[PDB]
Amino acid sequence: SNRRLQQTQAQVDEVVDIMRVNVDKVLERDQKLSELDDRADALQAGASQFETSAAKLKRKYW
Amino acid sequence: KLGKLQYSLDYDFQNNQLLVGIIQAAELPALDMGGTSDPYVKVFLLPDKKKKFETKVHRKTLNPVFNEQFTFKVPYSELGGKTLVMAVYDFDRFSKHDIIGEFKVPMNTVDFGHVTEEWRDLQSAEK
Amino acid sequence: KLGKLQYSLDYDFQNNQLLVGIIQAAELPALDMGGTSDPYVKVFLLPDKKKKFETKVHRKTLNPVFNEQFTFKVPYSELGGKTLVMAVYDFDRFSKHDIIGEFKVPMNTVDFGHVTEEWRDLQSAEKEQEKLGDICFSLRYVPTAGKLTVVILEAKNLKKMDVGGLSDPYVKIHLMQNGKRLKKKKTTIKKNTLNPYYNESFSFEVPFEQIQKVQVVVTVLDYDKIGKNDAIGKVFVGYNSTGAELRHWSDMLANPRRPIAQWHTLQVEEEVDAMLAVK
Amino acid sequence: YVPTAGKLTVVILEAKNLKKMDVGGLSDPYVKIHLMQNGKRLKKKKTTIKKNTLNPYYNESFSFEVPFEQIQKVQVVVTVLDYDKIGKNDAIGKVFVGYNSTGAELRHWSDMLANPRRPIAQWHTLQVEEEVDAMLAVK
Amino acid sequence: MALSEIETRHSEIIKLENSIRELHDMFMDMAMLVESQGEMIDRIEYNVEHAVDYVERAVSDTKKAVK
Amino acid sequence: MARENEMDENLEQVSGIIGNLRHMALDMGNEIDTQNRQIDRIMEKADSNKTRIDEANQRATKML
Amino acid sequence: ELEEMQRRADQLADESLESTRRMLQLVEESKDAGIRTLVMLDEQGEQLDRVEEGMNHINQDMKEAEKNLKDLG
Ligand SMILES: [Mg+2]
Ligand SMILES: [Mg+2]
Ligand SMILES: [Mg+2]
Ligand SMILES: [Mg+2]
């Protein structure tokens, strides 16, 4: 019964076509996550600086 | 302080209708005896208060999950100047159903094209 | 300890048939009144239990001599992956004929070419769990919000429930406390499947102060439209749980804001419900 | 327990701080020993009845025929009860050691196993009959 | 049938095995990438929580400073 | 025919497993998409707060 | 020629068989890899949610700080 063989083959091909797209989307996710990582590091750096300045200002105007 | 609300929003251009999905709500304040309220959400188009849609009443949960969907047959041109209202109500069998919260969404701030779905903090309704 | 068994084995290539000869047995333990048992040997091909051959019943001897012969019309190619079973039975006129012993011979260890004939010590016949099914799911609990996320992933090797076919499984989840069934959930019904895949998430409101006093009961059942729906298997995790279940629970506790997936072996509902009626 | 002869020697020594069962006075305690398996009560033994005592002293030995092949599948149930002539005799407390046992009980059991041809004495805390019997109905 | 039918059967079967293998490798790569990205998210959340702490303390200080 | 049938059973099981793999791939991809949208949101908010905190820090150090 | 032909046919049969077995193993590995992948997706998802709540908190706090700095100036 070649019908089942070829049908299963078509299933496999379909799932492959799904998975490669999924993989590319995952790569895009890796890019976005990396940039988010850099942005977060910069964010916490600025946060610490602003915290220090806030300490000075509290020790000034109170 | 009442809690947050997760909802979904998107527009079907094939049928020219607005698809508003009420996913769930969280951290709602308790107003009933058992320590939990009986919440249900009323949703309607903000511009005209006609044909308001109400969800099913959930018993005694401060984290109700509705997962319901409503359709507003409104053209895409009129949609831009139309707002959405989602208000959370507390059910009471022997008295007026007190409003827990409300939320308004301008359709000019909404971006259609990708299926939108977000959490937004509830606020106290205006007198 | 029962005794030994002398048998003969050889293959006739001219007729393409296996020649199994039962010579005799010795030092068999006595199970009958007179001080001697009534032994008879059942011999059949190990691979498929079809057309089993039985010897004549000898009266009251612990050293029976059968000197009988049996022929298994089996090709030489199929023979290699076929085993031989010789089990010694005790005859009783008014009850079930108890098995005295048994012996299995792999046909890949057997060397044909010379006529084989040997004595082999008898051993006690094997009587494991019947279900042999497993259910896999993930547990996630974050203590702050008190949310319990039970995601039914997938079951495998489930017991057949339908006649001449696979089963129609569905997962029912109960949440118990002090013997009471609080919440009731269920999944989609996957029809005709040996290994059902659901990937369905459920959430429960469980406070941090009662986390050590809750029971999570996962049950895999079969679905027929007509009549009562039977049950394939069930397992429980949480309060008064043991084994890999308590382990998975402790992993859920030790790892907050993170879901841990694990497999579990299905137990009979009687024992489980007997455990849940405790305390 | 000595594995060779399969003899189990349970010697009831003494109870203490038992719950009052009689009105305006001490209790009349006696020890009943059951040997269970698969939920069935096989052997039944009991001791002498010590009257009006806060801490009953028995020092009474009992022996049971337990094969070495079933040592991991036996239940020993010790019950302290109160004795009134008239009517049903109530129960003060009960504990069990052996199959499906936990706590200091399983410990004492394991000490009996690890130390053959030698008796190990130990104390045990009395539990309610409901929970214990609920544990014995398991498996 | 014949040897042609068996040969074509065998060929298409091998083809299926290779497609299956590619699918497999794709799943493996998937799990890999998702894991590494998981570690990335770990350090992101770390930096974020630190930032939150710093911001909170800063806000407290300014709030006490103005009044 | 036993050789052939045995193989047939194998191919059927492979078929079922492949179907399940399809479903899993769909769920996987979908959730990946939604999470990507969420990440976009996160970077928008993070850039917003970055600007907020830079301007605020400058204004704060200005009064020093 | 004939014997070698029959043996060839049976050979191809066996080869295809063990091939299908290899397929079963491969789709099993694929299956499990997929499962753990989904698990990772759930975990990292919740982590992303916590990140979002973090961002919101930061926004509100910096809004208040902005208010105080505008009240001080
Ligand atoms: Mg009410
Ligand atoms: Mg007899
Ligand atoms: Mg059925
Ligand atoms: Mg008395």
Numbering used by the authors:
A (entry chain A): 28 to 89
B (entry chain 1): 141 to 267
C (entry chain 3): 141 to 267, 550 to 701
D (entry chain 4): 563 to 701
E (entry chain B): 190 to 256
F (entry chain D): 140 to 203
G (entry chain C): 10 to 82
Paper's wording?
The proteins involved are known and well-characterized. This includes the SNARE (Soluble N-ethylmaleimide−sensitive factor attachment protein receptor) proteins (VAMP2, Syntaxin, and SNAP25) that catalyze synaptic vesicle (SV) fusion, as well as chaperones Munc13, Munc18, and regulators Complexin and Synaptotagmin1–4. Syt-1 is anchored in the SV by a transmembrane domain (TMD), which is connected to tandem cytosolic C2 domains (C2A & C2B) via a 60-residue flexible linker. Both C2 domains are eight stranded anti-parallel beta sandwiches with one calcium sensing region consisting of two aliphatic loops containing Aspartic acid (Asp) residues that bind Ca2+16–18 These conserved Asp residues coordinate Ca2+ with the acidic lipids, like phosphatidylserine (PS) and phosphatidylinositol 4, 5-bisphosphate (PIP2), to facilitate the membrane insertion of the flanking aliphatic loops. In addition, the C2B domain has a conserved poly-lysine motif that binds to PS/PIP2 headgroups to mediate Ca2+-independent membrane interaction.
This structure, derived from a helical crystal formed by covalently linked Syt1–SNARE protein applied to lipid tube surface, reveals that the Syt1 C2B domain concurrently binds both the SNARE proteins and the negatively charged membranes on diametrically opposite surfaces. The crystal structures were unambiguously docked into the EM map and showed SNAREpins arranged in an antiparallel fashion with membrane-distal C-terminal interaction. The Syt1 protein located between the SNARE complex and membrane surface, with the C2B domain interacting with the middle portion of SNARE complex. Relative position of C2B over the SNAREs was very similar to the recently described ‘primary’ binding site, involving the t-SNARE helices.
